[PDB]
């Protein structure tokens, strides 16, 4: 059969799939929602970003599935480090790639090599245009991986849990919305400050009824705004993203499966104590928050949209709990138990 991927390309659905290639490792998150209690059964190989840039979620899956260590790494954390030779010798029967990210895009040579080898390629997207692409991506993955039921179940769950936010924020007029700046991998980049424009976590700010101060500063989904521009705009709400492991002395916010509330609050505070940042009205007024970075490329991003709405309008979403949503997500779909801290408030 045939379907349209997120690059507009038609893909012939394989009769049976047993050798999935992951162009970006963290595309595993979309796969995990379909594979039930057998998450790694059909993965022939993956980019090393999941294992190296998601060490916490990795370790949790390793403790329950030690065979994860033996899935081949086709590269490190950049598209340019992928050996096309190692890829082809795994004889994949499907390759899942992202329109953007740490893996090959629609115009890469590897995509063309795979087309010459007779291997179907599917483009998904949770990163450039999450709002447009997240649900269509899951529907498509459902069809090509023969997990239509799991996919449709997850779409219903997602739509319902997002509708809990949008029923309220879709009617709020622009002049009542809080200004928001999201600093991606805050503290951890060479040059401050990474953020999202019209795309990526910007889509989440939009949905949650916020006003992204970088929406109109930037052409793309990702970009950079200077510290002074942030200070000058002086937004209502400051959000920092990170995924740093607890026992990592490098700069950044600690969030993820092995992070405690106190490690998340302490490390957010370091981030908020930085020169310039610490004079923001949002920081002084305590409207300062942390969000787990990898939500920037995951269909679990409904958790971030909900955390954002609850920060943007605390009393209108007093009754909404993203922790229940994660637990409903894990119990319904996944094969591990939820642990750690995926979001934090400054004390």
Given the rule CB under 6 A, which residues bind ligand A1I15? 53, 77-78, 100-102, 105, 184-185, 188-191, 194, 222, 243, 293, 296
273 binds, among a copy of itself, ligand A1I15, none (CB under 5 to 8 A by kind): a copy of itself
Question: Between 66 and 107, whose beta carbon lies closer to a copy of itself?
Answer: 66
Question: Between 75 and 92, whose beta carbon lies closer to ligand A1I15?
Answer: 75
What's the DSSP call for residue 191?
A: S
Q: Smallest distance, Å, CB 230 to ligand A1I15?
A: 15
190 binds, among a copy of itself, ligand A1I15, none (CB under 5 to 8 A by kind): ligand A1I15
What's the DSSP call for residue 14?
A: P
Q: Smallest distance, Å, CB 65 to a copy of itself?
A: 7
> Hey, which residues does 182 pair with through a beta bridge?
239
Phi, psi of 10 (to 5 degrees): -85, 135
Q: What is the 3-state secondary structure (H, E, C) of 48-71?
A: CHHHHHCHHHHHHHHHHCHHHHHC
Question: Between 88 and 231, whose beta carbon lies closer to a copy of itself?
Answer: 231
CB 333 within 8 A of CB 154: yes
16 binds, among a copy of itself, ligand A1I15, none (CB under 5 to 8 A by kind): none
CA 103 to chain centre: 14
CA 326 to chain centre: 14
CB 279 within 8 A of CB 231: yes
Question: Between 105 and 178, whose beta carbon lies closer to a copy of itself?
Answer: 178
CA distance 114 to 94: 9
List the structure tokens of 297. 């490329």
Question: Between 88 and 189, whose beta carbon lies closer to ligand A1I15?
Answer: 189
Binding region for a copy of itself (CB under 8 A): 15, 37-38, 40-41, 64-67, 148-149, 152, 156, 159-160, 163, 166-167, 170-174, 176, 178, 206-207, 228-229, 231-234, 236, 246-249, 254, 260, 262-263, 266-267, 269-270, 273, 286, 312-316, 318, 321, 323-324, 327-328, 331-332, 345, 347
- C-alpha pair distances (Å), 93 with each of 6, 44, 96, 122, 281: 19, 9, 10, 11, 53
List the structure tokens of 111. 């995509």
Question: Between 97 and 312, whose beta carbon lies closer to ligand A1I15?
Answer: 97
């Amino acid at each position: 059969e045939n379907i349209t991927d997120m690059a507009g390309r038609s893909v012939v659905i394989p009769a049976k799939v047993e050798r999935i290639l992951l162009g970006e490792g963290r595309l595993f998150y979309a796969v995990s929602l379909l594979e039930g209690q057998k998450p790694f059964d059909r993965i022939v190989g993956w980019q090393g970003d999941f294992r190296k840039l998601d060490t916490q979620t990795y370790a949790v899956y390793k403790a329950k599935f030690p065979q994860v260590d033996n899935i081949p790494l086709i590269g490190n954390t950049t598209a340019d480090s992928i050996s096309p030779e190692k890829v082809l010798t795994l004889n994949p029967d499907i390759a899942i790639f992202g329109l953007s990210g740490h893996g090959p895009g629609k115009n890469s040579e590897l995509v063309k090599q795979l087309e010459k080898a007779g291997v179907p390629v599917v483009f998904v997207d949770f990163r450039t245009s999450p709002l447009k692409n997240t649900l269509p991506s899951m529907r498509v993955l459902g069809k090509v991986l023969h997990r239509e039921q799991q996919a449709n179940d997850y779409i219903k769950f997602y739509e319902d849990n997002v509708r809990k936010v949008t029923e309220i924020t879709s009617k709020i007029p622009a002049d009542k919305k809080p200004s928001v700046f999201i600093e991606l991998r805050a503290g951890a980049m060479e040059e401050c400050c990474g953020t999202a424009g019209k795309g990526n976590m910007g889509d989440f700010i939009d949905q949650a009824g916020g006003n992204n101060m970088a929406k109109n500063l930037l052409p793309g989904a990702l970009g950079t705004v200077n510290l002074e521009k942030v200070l000058s705009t002086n937004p209502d709400i400051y959000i920092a993203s990170g995924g740093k492991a607890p026992d990592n002395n490098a700069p950044g916010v600690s969030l993820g499966a092995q992070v405690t509330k106190e490690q998340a609050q302490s490390s957010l505070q370091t981030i908020l104590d930085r020169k310039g940042i610490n004079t923001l009205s949002a920081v002084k007024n305590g409207r300062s928050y942390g969000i787990w970075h990898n939500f920037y490329n995951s269909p679990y991003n409904v958790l971030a949209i909900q955390s954002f709405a609850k920060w943007f309008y605390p009393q209108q979403f007093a009754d909404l709990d993203p922790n229940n949503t994660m637990n409903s997500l894990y119990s319904q779909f996944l094969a591990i138990e939820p642990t750690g801290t995926y979001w934090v408030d400054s004390t």
